[PDB]
Amino acid sequence: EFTVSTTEDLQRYRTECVSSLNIPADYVEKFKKWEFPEDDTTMCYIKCVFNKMQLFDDTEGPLVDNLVHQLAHGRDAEEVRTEVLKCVDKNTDNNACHWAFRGFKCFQKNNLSLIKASIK
Ligand SMILES: CCCCC/C=C\C/C=C\C/C=C\C/C=C\CCCC(=O)O
Ligand SMILES: [Co+2]
Ligand SMILES: [Co+2]
């Protein structure tokens, strides 16, 4: 049921989320440059994209098995899973947007290369 996301999948999901959340043009400009402001508009966008990629569920949180499928082929699944699990936490402030974004920010600090490589 999980399918890995390609570059085109991700571009479609970006477009869909910009549409459905009515993301302002200024934010889109920033997302294109990999700039993600610390605000609800951005956080809900990332949640939206992750929902569509089947990498995050609003109730269960990060979908670790799916993240490993997305990121790890050709690499050491154990290493990747370990790095993912370091960024997996509880929904302590009962906010799926905050939750999804926190995990993204955690992971991309040290694993940006792995993220970019996953999108072929
Ligand atoms: C437990 C924390 C897990 C966080 C994992 C981080 C990223 C997901 C991993 C692989 C999927 C690849 C790209 C999606 C990443 C960011 C959204 C792009 C937004 C945009 O470009 O407009
Ligand atoms: Co797999
Ligand atoms: Co392990």
Numbering used by the authors: 2 to 121
Show sentences the authors wrote.
Small differences are seen in the position of helix-7, which rotates out slightly from the binding pocket in the presence of larger fatty acids such that the Cα at Ile120 is approximately 2 Å displaced from its position with shorter chain fatty acids. The NMR structure of the AeOBP22-AA complex superimposes with the crystal structure with an RMSD of 0.67 Å for the backbone atoms of residues 7–120 and confirms that the monomeric structure observed in the crystal is maintained in solution. However, even in the crystal there are differences in the ligand position in the two monomers in the asymmetric unit.
Ae. aegypti OBP22 (AeOBP22) is a member of the OBP family of proteins that has been directly implicated in regulating these feeding behaviors. Our results provide evidence that fatty acids are likely natural ligands for AeOBP22 and that the binding of long-chain fatty acids (C15-C20) is enhanced by a conformational change in the C-terminal tail that is critical to generate a high affinity binding site.
